[PDB]
Design a protein around this nucleic acid. Structure first.
Ligand SMILES: Nc1nc2c(ncn2[C@H]2C[C@H](O)[C@@H](COP(=O)(O)CP(=O)(O)OP(=O)(O)O)O2)c(=O)[nH]1
Ligand SMILES: [Cl-]
Ligand SMILES: [Cl-]
Ligand SMILES: [Mg+2]
Ligand SMILES: [Mn+2]
Ligand SMILES: [Mn+2]
Ligand SMILES: [Mn+2]
Ligand code: NA
Ligand code: NA
Length: 312
DNA sequence: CGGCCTTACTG
DNA sequence: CAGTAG
DNA sequence: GCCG
């Protein structure tokens, strides 16, 4: 639905993002969750006592939601270090995180021009810098579809049986997608092998793939651009998995990230372990049979949720 | 007090 | 391994 | 940050 407390979240997001880019990950996680809670809430919040009651919101956070409701402002925001805007600028480079951002800042850099001419850049960071603007824009769902079909087409040319599905935000039904996450497998349980590498060659020779960021056993993180004019470069992620891990692979890749974390966390409390490979029992333990996503929720004693309902 | 998901690539 | 990322 |  819609957020009934944007006047609150909007202010907290600024602070959460500040801590994030500065390296205070755990505190930033607290705000991130506090924020997620406020958003998905039946109606607007009105009181302190009303705030604390909400899971994910404690005394310190409740206080802040108050200052906002009463002072209409968050004094804390008035003291965010002047290095934050630059740290955010830097970490928006794919391949560069909080540590690299702080280092560059310590060395005197303040702008991308500074980074381009003087900073030391890993191969990935150079690619991220080159597509800085493109990677900041979420693409129209329709374009996400075009990309999925492109990979599926190139893949099925090797084996018409190969199953290709765009997961991530796409499968969750979002209007726009930051990238395209394509899962590839095969019902025969063995044909998925021996393609990955050749598939990337096809897409590469075809001019579709323009830059590679990470190439591994079953995962690929790269960059693509549809043919024709008016096209931006888009991030593309592909994972090839054995059909026996389909349900878990699909569940993982569909996300959301926070949804995955919660689900894995729950599994953990029940003496189980959840990954993109399988759902098991604490130690490794035994692999529980999971033919479908629903089997995962069931085994975890959770009511099934549609992909569109997995925001967190 | 102390975890806060879990796995994988890069160098 | 640390850093970054899905 | 929050929570067990
Ligand atoms: N367990 C886990 N799963 C994750 C994590 N990050 C991502 N995933 C899973 C869940 C996530 O759905 C999937 C794709 O990750 P992206 O493509 O990076 C983010 P998307 O949701 O696709 O939305 P977009 O911003 O692209 O429009 O990997 C993480 O930290 N942990
Ligand atoms: Cl985190
Ligand atoms: Cl360009
Ligand atoms: Mg995505
Ligand atoms: Mn992705
Ligand atoms: Mn471009
Ligand atoms: Mn694996
Ligand atoms: Na609380
Ligand atoms: Na980055």
């Amino acid at each position: 639905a819609t957020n009934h407390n944007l006047h609150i979240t909007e202010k907290l997001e600024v602070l959460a993002k500040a801590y994030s880019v500065q390296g205070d990950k755990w505190r930033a996680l607290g705000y991130a969750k506090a924020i997620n809670a406020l958003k998905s809430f039946h109606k607007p919040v009105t009181s302190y006592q009303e705030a604390c009651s909400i899971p994910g919101i404690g005394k310190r956070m409740a206080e802040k939601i108050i200052e906002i409701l009463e002072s209409g402002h968050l004094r804390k925001l008035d003291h965010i270090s002047e290095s934050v805007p630059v740290l955010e600028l830097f970490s928006n480079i794919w391949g560069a995180g909080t540590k690299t951002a702080q280092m560059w800042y310590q060395q005197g850099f303040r702008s991308l021009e500074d980074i381009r001419s003087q900073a030391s850049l890993t191969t990935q960071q150079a690619i991220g810098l080159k597509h800085y603007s493109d990677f900041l824009e979420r693409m129209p769902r329709e374009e996400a579809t075009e990309i999925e079909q492109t990979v599926q087409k190139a893949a099925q040319a090797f084996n018409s049986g190969l199953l290709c599905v765009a997961c991530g935000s796409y499968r969750r039904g979002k209007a726009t997608c930051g990238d395209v996450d394509v899962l590839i497998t095969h019902p025969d349980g063995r044909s998925h092998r021996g393609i990955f590498s050749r598939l990337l060659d096809s897409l590469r020779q075809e001019g579709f793939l323009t830059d590679d960021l990470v190439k591994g056993e079953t995962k690929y993180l790269g960059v693509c651009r549809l043919p024709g004019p008016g096209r931006r470069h888009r991030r593309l992620d592909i994972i090839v998995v054995p059909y026996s891990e389909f349900a878990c692979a699909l569940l993982y890749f569909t996300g959301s990230a926070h949804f995955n974390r919660s689900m894995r966390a729950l599994a953990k409390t029940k003496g189980m372990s959840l990954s993109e490979h399988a759902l098991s029992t604490a130690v490794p333990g035994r692999v529980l049979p999971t033919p479908t996503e629903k089997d995962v929720f069931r085994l975890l004693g959770l009511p099934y949720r549609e992909p569109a309902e997995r925001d967190w």
